Amino acid sequence: SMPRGADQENMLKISGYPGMLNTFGIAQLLTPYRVNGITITGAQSAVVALENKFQVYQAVQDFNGKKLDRNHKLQVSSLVV
Amino acid sequence: SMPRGADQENMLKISGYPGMLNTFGIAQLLTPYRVNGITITGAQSAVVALENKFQVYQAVQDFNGKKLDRNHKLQVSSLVV
Ligand SMILES: [Cl-]
Ligand SMILES: [Cl-]
């Protein structure tokens, strides 16, 4: 799942993807960002460890509000805020 | 990690990617195929569990020989011959 000794500044919160995705599929959703761990927190929500805070900020810009289909829209935010 | 009850007929062998990829990055290589598990077998090799034999066959067609950069090209095959 998640590396035990991670820093919260590298973490991304992501929700709204289709519940069918497993943890590998969540990493696939975020290609090409390096993903170091994923914790599933809900039916359609997870926390994802990226490389550093610059990756987190760019991932937020790239994916937040993105429409996946008619019934799914991504909510993406930095864990540390 | 790799589920214990997985069948080798649903599995592919993948090698030649940059050794700096982790298990999540190997799944990202294979987007959008559903990945159910991954076992690292070497510095630049792994075994990946897909959904069924059709996915294994199409993943081989799609990814075998793919050039990632000047020094890296993928070798992809069915685990069982
Ligand atoms: Cl996907
Ligand atoms: Cl949720």
Curated annotation (Swiss-Prot), chains A, B:
Job description of the protein: Component of the pid-1 and tost-1 variants of the PETISCO complexes, which have roles in the biogenesis of a class of 21 nucleotide PIWI-interacting RNAs (piRNAs) that possess a uracil residue at the 5'-end (also called 21U-RNAs) and embryogenesis, respectively. Within the pid-1 variant of the PETISCO complex may stabilize 21U-RNA precursor molecules. Promotes the biogenesis of 21U-RNAs. Required for chromosome segregation and cell division in early embryos.
Subunit architecture: Component of the pid-1 variant of the PETISCO complex (also called the pid-3, erh-2, tofu-6, and ife-3 small RNA complex) containing at least pid-1, tofu-6, ife-3, pid-3, and erh-2, which is required for the biogenesis of a class of 21 nucleotide PIWI-interacting RNAs (piRNAs) that possess a uracil residue at the 5'-end (also called 21U-RNAs). Within the complex interacts with pid-1; the interaction is direct.
Gene: pid-3
Knocked-out gene: effects: RNAi-mediated knockdown results in chromosome segregation and cell division defects in early embryos. RNAi-mediated knockdown results in defective activity of the PIWI-interacting RNA (piRNA) silencing pathway. RNAi-mediated knockdown disrupts the localization of tofu-6 and erh-2 to the perinuclear region of the germline. Instead erh-2 accumulates in the nucleus. RNAi-mediated knockdown results in decreased expression of tost-1 in the germline and in embryos.
Disulfide bridges in this chain: none
Full protein segment contained here: 196 to 274 of 307
Cell compartment(s), UniProt: Cytoplasm; Cytoplasm, Perinuclear region; Nucleus
The protein, known as: Protein pid-3
Tissue specificity as recorded in UniProt: Expressed in the germline (at protein level).
